[PDB]
Design a protein around this ligand. Structure first.
Ligand SMILES: Cc1cccc([C@H]2CC[C@H]([NH+]3CCN(c4cncc(Br)c4)CC3)CC2)c1
Ligand SMILES: Cc1cccc([C@H]2CC[C@H]([NH+]3CCN(c4cncc(Br)c4)CC3)CC2)c1
Ligand SMILES: [Ca+2]
Length: 604
């Protein structure tokens, strides 16, 4: 798609090279353009490719000596914005502020220019293909390029500090998205110097269109530099006891007060890898440790002891399935037949089956309770880098499978083990979710997750590629030999199964010492062993070897997040009689109704 602007920028320079007026304005030839405006009166209001003016060109290629003439010969071009869609709304002041041309900006204000010129051009939007996002106002441009002299001159001419963009962002919301956090921190405080001054209606309370104060946005963006610079307005010093320093934190726009207004709600839902780096700062790291030590760790282990026993009961009733003989004289049709089906669909006898019946009634409510607490979370994606994604799928597919096994219990089939088997492994594989905040196997469980999707999925595709060539060759060689003393590949499905069974050295390999096997097998099996058993398989060890310590730190950082994120989940879906709010009420004491956190440190 980028060809448009590429062609347009090429079509731009073509028309500049074509029309001799803008060619002189681009190259700043004041002696030549005077011959055009007055002698052979040139069309002054020429509109180029992007609906631009000749003044817009002199501001681009910083030629302030030529634009001085255009202001003295036509001082109304300053009010002309770019008429194209790419640069709609952009004026000559924006380019002069971006390029930081002081005497050009200082002369534009001597002739009047809209300091609120909403540059709504398409390339000014906050998009990935747009390399920067300096906002829509010339004050944001001056603050983005980091020029105090331009910022105050716009304030000296009535610039709007709290001017929101299209996305509801003020001008502070844009500074956080900038890379140069070192110098932008100075610009932020300098920009706040022109605040309304009152205790209300300040810029740090004006939220994004999506409801994000600048303090909240810094956490989602992982801008630790701008984040800690915003903490000084909120933190409170208690006393100076030598090296010690008791510090009080305003704890307001951080702790989970209401619903989505929690700051930790954004850290756990975002995908930005630098947001995981936020919960190590001096207010958050201590709080999440307190919320996890008390209340956090115990309440989770209860659900662990609750859920683990719930699966044992379901397993205890699954292992005690109904029992019936064959019922049919089909004992020999296809000698390979070996089934012994289950019993009546009613089965109203009640000796000790009433003991197994109550467990089935225990297994149905746990599934619908899961559905009654997880189906209300129909949030798109958010599942399988993410945290509790796969388990929710494991849990809701387990619950749906048992709800099928209850429908399968009646009316249909004979021994519906399809919903019995799925709801058994998933029920036990889900207890790996209750790892997480458990010291030693928390980073373990996220590592095998980061390994089942990465190196294992790389290996599984190349593994399936190999066996299909051999299993077909194995079936072909053994679609003509006896399946009674060997026949590991009697039908093509078992050919694939027995060949795949040999990729992992599970079975013993076909090798009967009473037959003259097709020597193609002896050759095909040897090449199958060298490639698959050591070259392909031992390299999986080496592939798991390198990519382990490469992520042996991000896994722990992910583990702290999934410990903190799980600590956040309980505080929401649990009531209030248990799990009280962290901190101390600001009222009664000197403050009022707010909450504060006590933290001491140690200098040197
Ligand atoms: C901490 C944590 C949270 C969520 C998931 C996990 C891992 C273990 C459980 C899951 N896997 C995959 C799904 N499932 C399965 C079962 N049978 C065959 C196949 Br393929 C797959 C169980 C194992 C996924 C990765 C860890
Ligand atoms: C099969 C297997 C299992 C586990 C590890 C390995 C090797 C991978 C490379 C690793 N070591 C250390 C990481 N890295 C390093 C080397 N020197 C100094 C510094 Br600090 C770091 C590379 C060497 C370990 C040895 C092989
Ligand atoms: Ca063996």
């Amino acid at each position: 798609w980028a060809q448009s602007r590429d062609e347009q920028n090429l079509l731009q320079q073509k028309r500049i090279w074509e029309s001799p007026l803008l060619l002189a304005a681009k190259e700043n030839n004041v002696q030549a353009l005077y011959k055009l405006l007055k002698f052979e009166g040139c069309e002054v209001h020429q509109k180029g490719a992007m609906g631009e003016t000749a003044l817009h060109i002199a501001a681009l290629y910083d030629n302030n000596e030529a634009a001085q003439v255009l202001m003295e010969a036509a001082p109304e071009l300053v009010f002309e914005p770019m008429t194209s869609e790419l640069y709609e709304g952009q004026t000559a002041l924006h380019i002069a502020v971006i390029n930081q041309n002081v005497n050009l900006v200082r002369a534009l204000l001597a002739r009047g220019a809209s300091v609120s010129a909403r540059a709504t051009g398409s390339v000014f939007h906050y998009r990935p293909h747009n390399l920067i996002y300096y906002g829509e106002h010339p004050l944001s441009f001056a603050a983005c390029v980091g020029s105090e002299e331009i910022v105050r001159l716009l304030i000296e001419h009535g610039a709007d500090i709290r001017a929101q963009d299209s996305l509801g962002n003020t001008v502070l919301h844009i500074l956080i998205l900038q890379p140069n956090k070192t110098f932008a921190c100075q610009m932020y405080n300098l920009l706040l110097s022109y605040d309304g001054g009152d205790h209300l209606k300040s810029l740090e309370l004006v939220p994004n269109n999506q409801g994000l104060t600048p303090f909240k946005l810094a956490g989602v963006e992982g801008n630790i530099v701008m984040f800690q610079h915003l903490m000084q307005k909120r933190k409170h010093i208690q006393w100076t006891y030598g090296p010690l320093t008791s510090t009080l934190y305003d704890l307001t726009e951080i702790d989970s007060s209401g619903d989505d207004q929690s700051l930790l709600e954004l850290i756990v839902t975002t995908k930005k890898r630098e947001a995981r780096q936020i919960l190590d700062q001096t207010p958050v790291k201590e709080l999440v440790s307190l919320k996890w030590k008390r209340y956090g760790r115990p309440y989770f282990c209860v659900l662990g002891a609750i859920y683990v026993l719930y699966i044992i009961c379901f397993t205890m009733c699954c292992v005690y399935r109904p029992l019936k003989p064959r019922i049919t004289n089909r004992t020999n049709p296809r000698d390979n037949t070996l089934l012994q089906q289950k019993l009546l669909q009613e089965a109203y006898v009640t000796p000790k089956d009433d003991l197994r019946l109550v467990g089935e009634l225990v297994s149905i409510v746990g599934a619908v309770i899961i559905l009654l607490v997880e189906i209300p979370d129909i949030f798109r994606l958010g599942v399988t880098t993410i945290l509790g994604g796969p388990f929710h799928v494991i849990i809701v597919t387990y619950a749906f499978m048992v709800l099928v096994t209850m429908v399968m219990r009646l009316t249909n089939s004979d021994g519906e083990v399809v919903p019995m088997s799925f709801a058994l492994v998933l029920g036990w594989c889900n207890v790996m979710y209750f790892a997480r905040g458990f010291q030693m196997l928390g980073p373990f469980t996220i590592m095998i997750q980061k390994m089942i999707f990465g190196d294992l999925m790389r290996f599984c595709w190349l593994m399936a590629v190999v066996i299909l060539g051999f299993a077909s060759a194995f079936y072909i060689i053994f679609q003509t030999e006896d399946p009674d003393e060997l026949g590991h590949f009697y039908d093509y499905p078992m050919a694939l199964f027995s060949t795949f069974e040999l990729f992992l050295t599970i079975i013993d390999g076909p090798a009967n010492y009473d037959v003259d096997l097709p020597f193609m097998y002896s050759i095909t099996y040897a090449a199958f062993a060298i490639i698959a058993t050591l070259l392909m398989l031992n390299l999986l060890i080496a592939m798991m070897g390198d990519t382990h310590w490469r992520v042996a730190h991000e896994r722990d950082e992910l583990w702290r997040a999934q410990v903190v994120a799980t600590t956040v989940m309980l505080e929401r879906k649990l009531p209030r009689c248990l799990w009280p709010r962290s901190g101390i009420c600001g009222r009664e004491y000197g403050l009022g109704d707010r909450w504060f956190l006590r933290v001491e440190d140690r200098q040197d």
